[PDB]
């Protein structure tokens, strides 16, 4: 079985072809970073216009990449939400009308489920049950996964998600939007323990998060110190170490509470080098296991949508002729499979 996946929820056009026997057959990606950088954030109108010029050519390139023709595709999967209504609508209208024209089922996919299931694309995929740490731009959640579509929210952030906290501090460190990865590169040249940032919500028990106060601590530290590269790299490292220690403490607590032996990390922030090593080390001590997506499948791609689309198609999730986008769509609201 072959599923074509379409991802256009934010600033990246992702097209992929996933075969449940042979694995990933094609993976195409166009990033709009340079388009939005100058505005310091994604301009919805500019993002929507760019998905229009890249969706159809990238579908055409993905088919020629995998050396397949139209009839080799059994279903079309597209991100229906959450995301930007304007960007979502590009992939959803192209995706649904393509499925109609090819006379194949169309699969609306939840973008966060896409991220969550991205580690299922690697060898030795996680078995249920597992604790999932979803660390994205807008969300930071601890989820109890007991099956596919069986997601129990254990904890979430009350303010900034870990990803936006990374972007906000990177802006203050003079980096271009989105600065999260560049902050992490700066941090790798940093001196351990030079500065010590707090770990919010870790004094009291509970699984909820808070990162807004790290932005303020960072801002005040930048102002109270010199502007040399080494100082800024030491602040970048102190910020990263605090976010990772916080995420590690909360993951530990969730594993204890649930009683689970498996931990899965997903979302853009799960690409972080320091987070991957610290969570790996903790699971080795617990005598458990960590599961990650490859770094490219941590951020927006179409492979996770073609994969999650295939799982939903096997469970009976099909779209009617009406196209529907859900810019606000909670992971808890999605039905169990």
């Amino acid at each position: 079985m072959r599923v074509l996946g379409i991802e256009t929820s934010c600033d990246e056009t992702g097209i992929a072809i996933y075969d449940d026997k042979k694995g990933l057959l094609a993976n195409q990606l166009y990033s709009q970073v340079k388009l939005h950088a100058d505005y310091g954030g994604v301009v919805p109108e500019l993002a929507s216009r760019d998905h229009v010029r890249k969706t159809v050519p990238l579908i055409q390139a993905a088919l020629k990449e995998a050396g397949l023709t139209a009839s080799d595709i059994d279903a079309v999967a597209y991100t229906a939400g959450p995301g930007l209504v304007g960007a979502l609508l590009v992939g959803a209208t192209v995706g649904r009308s393509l499925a109609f024209a090819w006379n194949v089922p169309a699969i609306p996919v939840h973008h966060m489920e896409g991220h969550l299931l991205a580690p299922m694309l690697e060898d030795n995929p996680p078995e249920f049950p597992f604790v999932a740490l979803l660390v994205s731009g807008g969300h930071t959640q601890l989820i109890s996964v007991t099956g596919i579509g069986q997601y129990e929210l254990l904890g979430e952030s009350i303010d900034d998600a870990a990803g936006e906290a990374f972007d906000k501090t990177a802006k203050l460190l003079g980096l271009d939007y989105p600065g999260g990865p560049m902050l992490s590169k700066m941090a790798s040249q940093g001196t351990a323990g030079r500065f010590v940032f707090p770990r919010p919500m870790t004094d009291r028990p509970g699984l909820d998060f808070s990162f807004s106060g790290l932005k303020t601590f960072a801002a005040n530290t930048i102002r109270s110190n010199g502007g040399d590269e080494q100082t800024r790299a030491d602040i970048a490292r102190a910020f990263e170490d605090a976010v990772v220690d916080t995420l590690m403490i909360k993951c530990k607590r969730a594993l204890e509470s649930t009683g689970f032996k498996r931990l899965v990390m997903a979302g853009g922030v799960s690409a972080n080098r320091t987070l991957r090593a610290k969570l790996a080390e903790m699971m080795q001590k617990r005598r458990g296991e960590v599961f990650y997506a490859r770094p490219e499948f941590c951020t927006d791609n179409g492979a996770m949508i073609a994969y999650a689309g295939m799982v939903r198609f096997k469970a009976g999730v099909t779209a009617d002729l009406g196209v529907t986008v859900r810019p606000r769509w909670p992971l808890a609201e999605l039905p169990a499979a």
Binding site: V56, T93, S97, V323
Partner: protein, 226 residues
Amino acid sequence: MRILAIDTATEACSVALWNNGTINAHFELCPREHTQRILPMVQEILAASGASLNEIDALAFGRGPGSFTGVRIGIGIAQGLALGANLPMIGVSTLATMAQGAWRKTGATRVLAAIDARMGEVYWAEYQRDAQGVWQGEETEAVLKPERVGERLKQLSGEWATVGTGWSAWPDLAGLTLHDGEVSLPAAEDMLPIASQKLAAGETVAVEHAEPVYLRNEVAWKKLPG
């Protein structure tokens, strides 16, 4: 020939099919329901004329201008269908489509098309039908302030029919002899004679070349300091 036309650039949802002259059409006001109504309308108009999507010779689409969202719904749906069925595509101006509608309804050969774009500006065009039924004046398509339109009306002469929501938004814009064109919104059935002329001239594009015509290309965001 067989031509399928679709339009969602404005507050209306419309589809139409041309089969060597005979036309089957459907039009409806679908505010906030564009994505919910377009593919059921396509499936129904094809089933009605017993036509298969694979037998279509050209897919005509509302290229704009109009609602940015609406124009992108129309191009998205048309691109998926054309890519899926390997169909040549024909972009038809929403301004010229309303001119054709005014001619079909009133016999008007000289049309002043104005769409009420947000921010108090209008999408403007001066369209004149020639002896061959071709609407001339595509180079006049622009986004203008009503004051600039009023100045432009002083430069024109004769009898004109008015079409579009621009005249609803600014009815005090109406030296010239103006008549109501009886068209506020485009219909896909009025795209079919324009698409038929374009297909005959070999002026079709492949799916990857289909582009929207927004006219307003200015961003409603300032760039970061310096």
